[PDB]
Amino acid sequence: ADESWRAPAIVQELAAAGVEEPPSRYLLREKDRSDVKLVAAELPEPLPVVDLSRLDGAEEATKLRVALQNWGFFLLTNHGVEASLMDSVMNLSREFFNQPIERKQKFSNLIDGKNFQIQGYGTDRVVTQDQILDWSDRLHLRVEPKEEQDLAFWPDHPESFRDVLNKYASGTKRIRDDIIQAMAKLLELDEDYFLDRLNEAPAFARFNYYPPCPRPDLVFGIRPHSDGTLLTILLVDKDVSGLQVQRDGKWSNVEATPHTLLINLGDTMEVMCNGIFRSPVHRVVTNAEKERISLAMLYSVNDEKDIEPAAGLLDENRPARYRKVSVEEFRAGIFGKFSRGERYIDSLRI
Ligand SMILES: O=C(O)CCC(=O)C(=O)O
Numbered sequence: 001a002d003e004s005w006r007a008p009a010i011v012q013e014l015a016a017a018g019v020e021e022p023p024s025r026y027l028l029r030e031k032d033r034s035d036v037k038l039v040a041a042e043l044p045e046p047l048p049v050v051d052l053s054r055l056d057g058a059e060e061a062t063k064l065r066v067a068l069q070n071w072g073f074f075l076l077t078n079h080g081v082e083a084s085l086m087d088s089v090m091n092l093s094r095e096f097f098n099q100p101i102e103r104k105q106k107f108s109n110l111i112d113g114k115n116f117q118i119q120g121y122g123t124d125r126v127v128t129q130d131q132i133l134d135w136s137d138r139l140h141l142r143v144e145p146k147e148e149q150d151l152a153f154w155p156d157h158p159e160s161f162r163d164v165l166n167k168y169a170s171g172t173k174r175i176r177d178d179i180i181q182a183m184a185k186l187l188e189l190d191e192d193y194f195l196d197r198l199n200e201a202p203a204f205a206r207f208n209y210y211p212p213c214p215r216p217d218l219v220f221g222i223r224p225h226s227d228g229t230l231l232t233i234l235l236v237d238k239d240v241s242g243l244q245v246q247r248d249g250k251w252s253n254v255e256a257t258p259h260t261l262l263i264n265l266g267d268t269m270e271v272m273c274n275g276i277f278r279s280p281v282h283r284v285v286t287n288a289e290k291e292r293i294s295l296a297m298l299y300s301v302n303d304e305k306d307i308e309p310a311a312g313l314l315d316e317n318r319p320a321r322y323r324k325v326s327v328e329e330f331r332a333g334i335f336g337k338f339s340r341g342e343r344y345i346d347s348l349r350i
């Protein structure tokens, strides 16, 4: 029939219309229903914190190693990005999502109202009619390489959105480079081993918007997933919690102070470092009272080399833990398995 299921609703509009319950395509399926944690732990463990300005020192590099091996992510302080620039990119995000739907839909990622592409305002690809939908919208923009930006999908109001996002992305790219240099040293690989695969590499800004949900126990704001990136640099809502990370089968809340950044490895890095460091599975749970926003800067490698464990980590006593795949096949796997709520990297394990 008419594949209207391929063009899902804007979730912010569902919430504004006043749905009393999540429509059926957003409902989790038992397995995920039993694992939705809405209550905080009351005695959470301290989270790993890394001070970028101290990262040349052995003691700080050790804190990074502990974070990368045991958590897959860390809070980052003293990272050099002006606090007011962080405020501006988030507030201009709020200003965009607060615009009338008529205006926002000019940036829809459903071309002609039906044809899906990644870039734009909407949600991720709907592959099957029985696919579960997340309780969020997102504005997904290619920021890098700068010459490949399509400004027809960048909001023109607020007027400064483009300038502020580009300035913000310049800072997070510098952070990306500093972190990957420290990771190369931890792995005893050439300090520029990852820089070669980042030449003219794609990078994206994912502005997530999680509307309030009348039944936060029945949906996910964004489904459990690991990022497919090399590195993700995440700026979370400073007022509204919801991010959670999986560690040893348990979910725990991730709470960050304003202007602290969250850095996590993606599946590309887990493969390239042969699983010495882990790409963490995370999710966002909704709440019934307030919307939540986040901005994920998603840093991928270029398509010049196949994705595989670094040769310097492999020898006669140290086998590869993941098989080699082209970037095109890796991309299709990350995107396709996300739609099914499955973990693509598991299919690569040897
Ligand atoms: O909203 C968040 O805190 C997480 C976003 C996220 O996981 C992603 O955009 O990949």
Ligand SMILES: [Mn+2]
Pocket: 225, 226, 227, 282, 296
């Ligand atoms: Mn993510």
